[PDB]
Design an enzyme around this catalytic site. Structure first.
Site, PDB file in Angstrom:
ATOM      1  N   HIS A  55      10.661   3.830   3.397  1.00 17.23           N
ATOM      2  CA  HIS A  55      10.117   2.694   3.283  1.00 17.23           C
ATOM      3  C   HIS A  55       9.834   2.053   1.899  1.00 17.23           C
ATOM      4  O   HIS A  55       9.762   0.779   1.639  1.00 17.23           O
ATOM      5  CB  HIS A  55       8.547   2.895   3.822  1.00 17.23           C
ATOM      6  CG  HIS A  55       7.540   1.781   3.854  1.00 17.23           C
ATOM      7  ND1 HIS A  55       7.516   0.923   4.511  1.00 17.23           N
ATOM      8  CD2 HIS A  55       6.376   1.681   2.650  1.00 17.23           C
ATOM      9  CE1 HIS A  55       6.521  -0.027   4.132  1.00 17.23           C
ATOM     10  NE2 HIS A  55       6.024   0.473   2.908  1.00 17.23           N
ATOM     11  N   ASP A  94       5.605  -4.978   2.137  1.00 17.82           N
ATOM     12  CA  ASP A  94       4.651  -4.070   2.964  1.00 17.82           C
ATOM     13  C   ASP A  94       3.366  -5.245   3.021  1.00 17.82           C
ATOM     14  O   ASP A  94       3.745  -6.303   3.413  1.00 17.82           O
ATOM     15  CB  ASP A  94       4.271  -2.590   2.050  1.00 17.82           C
ATOM     16  CG  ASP A  94       3.125  -1.949   2.791  1.00 17.82           C
ATOM     17  OD1 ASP A  94       3.290  -1.264   4.078  1.00 17.82           O
ATOM     18  OD2 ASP A  94       2.048  -1.974   2.408  1.00 17.82           O
ATOM     19  N   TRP A  95       2.393  -4.749   2.637  1.00 15.96           N
ATOM     20  CA  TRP A  95       1.212  -5.886   2.782  1.00 15.96           C
ATOM     21  C   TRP A  95       1.063  -6.631   1.628  1.00 15.96           C
ATOM     22  O   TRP A  95       0.490  -7.808   1.847  1.00 15.96           O
ATOM     23  CB  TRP A  95      -0.210  -4.927   2.587  1.00 15.96           C
ATOM     24  CG  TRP A  95      -0.743  -4.159   3.892  1.00 15.96           C
ATOM     25  CD1 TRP A  95      -0.631  -2.981   4.003  1.00 15.96           C
ATOM     26  CD2 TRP A  95      -0.705  -5.044   4.880  1.00 15.96           C
ATOM     27  NE1 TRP A  95      -1.346  -2.786   5.499  1.00 15.96           N
ATOM     28  CE2 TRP A  95      -1.266  -3.917   5.896  1.00 15.96           C
ATOM     29  CE3 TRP A  95      -1.262  -6.405   5.481  1.00 15.96           C
ATOM     30  CZ2 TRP A  95      -1.977  -4.198   7.154  1.00 15.96           C
ATOM     31  CZ3 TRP A  95      -1.703  -6.650   6.574  1.00 15.96           C
ATOM     32  CH2 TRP A  95      -2.036  -5.526   7.627  1.00 15.96           C
ATOM     33  N   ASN A 107       0.794  -1.162   0.097  1.00 14.14           N
ATOM     34  CA  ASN A 107       0.062   0.019  -0.026  1.00 14.14           C
ATOM     35  C   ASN A 107       0.722   1.226   0.043  1.00 14.14           C
ATOM     36  O   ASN A 107       1.748   1.366   0.842  1.00 14.14           O
ATOM     37  CB  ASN A 107      -1.042   0.083   1.083  1.00 14.14           C
ATOM     38  CG  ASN A 107      -2.128   1.153   1.177  1.00 14.14           C
ATOM     39  OD1 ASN A 107      -2.572   1.383   0.143  1.00 14.14           O
ATOM     40  ND2 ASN A 107      -2.214   1.866   2.217  1.00 14.14           N
ATOM     41  N   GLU A 158      10.657  -4.508   4.585  1.00 19.37           N
ATOM     42  CA  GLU A 158       9.745  -3.724   4.984  1.00 19.37           C
ATOM     43  C   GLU A 158       8.381  -4.390   5.277  1.00 19.37           C
ATOM     44  O   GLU A 158       7.159  -3.915   4.797  1.00 19.37           O
ATOM     45  CB  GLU A 158       9.546  -2.491   4.249  1.00 19.37           C
ATOM     46  CG  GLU A 158      10.740  -1.323   4.504  1.00 19.37           C
ATOM     47  CD  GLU A 158      10.768  -0.587   5.431  1.00 19.37           C
ATOM     48  OE1 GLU A 158       9.770  -0.114   6.308  1.00 19.37           O
ATOM     49  OE2 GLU A 158      11.866  -0.393   6.219  1.00 19.37           O
TER      50      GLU A 158
HETATM   51  O1  NSW Z   1      -0.441  -0.459   8.014  1.00 19.36           O
HETATM   52  C1  NSW Z   1       0.731  -0.067   7.529  1.00 19.36           C
HETATM   53  N1  NSW Z   1       1.569  -0.843   7.087  1.00 19.36           N
HETATM   54  C2  NSW Z   1       1.662  -2.237   6.691  1.00 19.36           C
HETATM   55  C3  NSW Z   1       2.725  -2.754   7.629  1.00 19.36           C
HETATM   56  C4  NSW Z   1       2.638  -3.081   9.005  1.00 19.36           C
HETATM   57  C5  NSW Z   1       3.608  -3.658   9.660  1.00 19.36           C
HETATM   58  C6  NSW Z   1       4.884  -4.089   9.030  1.00 19.36           C
HETATM   59  O2  NSW Z   1       6.147  -4.627   9.714  1.00 19.36           O
HETATM   60  C7  NSW Z   1       5.149  -3.600   7.583  1.00 19.36           C
HETATM   61  C8  NSW Z   1       3.968  -2.816   6.922  1.00 19.36           C
HETATM   62  N2  NSW Z   1       2.463   0.399   6.765  1.00 19.36           N
HETATM   63  C9  NSW Z   1       2.030   1.263   6.872  1.00 19.36           C
HETATM   64  C10 NSW Z   1       2.864   2.562   6.739  1.00 19.36           C
HETATM   65  C11 NSW Z   1       4.074   2.553   6.147  1.00 19.36           C
HETATM   66  C12 NSW Z   1       4.310   3.670   5.350  1.00 19.36           C
HETATM   67  C13 NSW Z   1       3.815   3.985   4.197  1.00 19.36           C
HETATM   68  C14 NSW Z   1       4.209   5.086   3.598  1.00 19.36           C
HETATM   69  C15 NSW Z   1       4.970   6.087   4.107  1.00 19.36           C
HETATM   70  C16 NSW Z   1       5.536   5.767   5.191  1.00 19.36           C
HETATM   71  C17 NSW Z   1       5.414   4.713   5.972  1.00 19.36           C
HETATM   72  N3  NSW Z   1       2.179   3.534   7.487  1.00 19.36           N
HETATM   73  C18 NSW Z   1       1.048   3.602   7.859  1.00 19.36           C
HETATM   74  C19 NSW Z   1       0.596   4.873   8.348  1.00 19.36           C
HETATM   75  C20 NSW Z   1       1.411   5.973   8.512  1.00 19.36           C
HETATM   76  C21 NSW Z   1       0.690   7.142   8.695  1.00 19.36           C
HETATM   77  C22 NSW Z   1      -0.662   7.500   8.918  1.00 19.36           C
HETATM   78  O3  NSW Z   1      -1.128   8.644   9.126  1.00 19.36           O
HETATM   79  C23 NSW Z   1      -1.587   6.178   8.654  1.00 19.36           C
HETATM   80  C24 NSW Z   1      -0.944   4.975   8.692  1.00 19.36           C
HETATM   81  C25 NSW Z   1       0.116   2.371   8.074  1.00 19.36           C
HETATM   82  N4  NSW Z   1       0.927   1.409   7.786  1.00 19.36           N
END
Ligand code: NSW
Length: 295
Positions: free
Chosen positions: A273, A108-109, A41, A132
């Site tokens: 990321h 990621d996902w 994502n 990641e």
């Molecule tokens: O679920 C989320 N995964 C899945 C995941 C979980 C555990 C793991 O070890 C790996 C992957 N990743 C993210 C990210 C990651 C990211 C995306 C883009 C830029 C910077 C960071 N960021 C968020 C979030 C950040 C701010 C917000 O305001 C809202 C959501 C959520 N997730």
């Protein structure tokens, strides 16, 4: 360089259940390895465009767009939970002529989807390269990037407004975790699936709402992650390649989660990321070397 039109004109489409998924498939030919690339994502198969050419010399490379993303179909009930994605991705796996043993490259996902697919088809797995990645349930926020409050916000009704109306994930989060600046052609490729406001952006909102937080996550996701984490933690016969990002985002936490996993090699590259946009050549060469050692 390569534009969205340029990339997706190299991709195929296949019917999947009631819908269809788009995917890259390397030119048919003689090959000893088949490698599947899973994005997360809010990206698409476009995320692997500069990694894949370093692996194609030695492997058939597939990269699907997850349902509702890239050029794959939009679902009318707008339900894109982890379990929905797995339904369509599993059917996709069944429809693209896979040999018996594949290597998964995930992010990621996409790593959540791939780890679960590997855990459910353990006999099909030649190797796993991840980065990641969703390697465990988040049990204490102090061992992870401090996004607790952001997740609470994104789970709130403000989530609909931030994403569906303002496209927060594409316009703010995505460029913030790429060290370099994307050309406008590159950024438009990431925009293209979500240009229409509203429910077309629903996957980039549902995905963070699925994050498996102990005591605060969807319990179907937690159970899945727990089960694939258990299996991965002792997967002696599964060669694994953890590509660590520096400084990364989750990379530091993942290092600690997997420090005692058997049969994992770690290679480090520069990036945040979305490390594929900062070190694609290093990432592709590492995967190439990893496949070369497999034989
Ligand atoms: O679920 C989320 N995964 C899945 C995941 C979980 C555990 C793991 O070890 C790996 C992957 N990743 C993210 C990210 C990651 C990211 C995306 C883009 C830029 C910077 C960071 N960021 C968020 C979030 C950040 C701010 C917000 O305001 C809202 C959501 C959520 N997730």
């Amino acid at each position: 360089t390569a534009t969205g039109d340029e990339w997706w004109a190299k991709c195929k489409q296949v019917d999947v259940l009631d819908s269809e998924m788009s995917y890259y498939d390397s030119d048919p030919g003689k090959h000893k390895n088949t490698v599947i690339f899973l994005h997360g994502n809010p990206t698409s198969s476009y995320l692997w465009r500069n990694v894949i050419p370093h692996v194609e010399p030695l492997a058939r490379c597939l990269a699907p767009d997850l349902i509702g993303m890239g050029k794959s179909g939009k679902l009318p009930n707008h339900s894109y939970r982890f379990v929905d994605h797995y339904r369509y991705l599993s059917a996709w796996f069944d429809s693209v002529n896979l040999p018996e043993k594949v290597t998964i490259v995930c992010h990621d996902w996409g790593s959540g989807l791939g780890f679960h697919w590997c855990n459910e088809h353990r006999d099909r797995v030649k190797g796993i390269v991840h980065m990641e990645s969703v390697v465990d349930v988040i049990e204490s926020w102090d061992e992870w990037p401090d996004i607790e409050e952001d997740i609470a916000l994104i789970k709130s009704e403000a989530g609909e407004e931030m994403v569906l109306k303002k496209n927060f994930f594409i316009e703010r989060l995505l460029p913030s975790s790429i060290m370099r600046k994307l050309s406008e052609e590159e950024m438009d490729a990431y925009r293209e699936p979500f240009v229409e406001p509203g429910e077309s952006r629903r996957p980039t909102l549902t995905w963070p709402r699925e994050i498996p937080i102990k005591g605060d996550g969807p319990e179907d996701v937690i159970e899945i992650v727990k089960s694939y984490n258990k299996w991965l933690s002792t997967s002696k016969d599964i060669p694994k390649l953890f590509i660590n990002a520096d400084p990364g985002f989750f990379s530091n936490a993942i290092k600690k989660v997997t420090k005692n996993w058997p049969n994992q090699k770690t290679v480090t590259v520069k990036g945040l990321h979305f490390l594929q946009e900062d070190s694609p050549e290093e990432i592709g060469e590492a995967i190439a070397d990893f496949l070369n050692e497999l034989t």
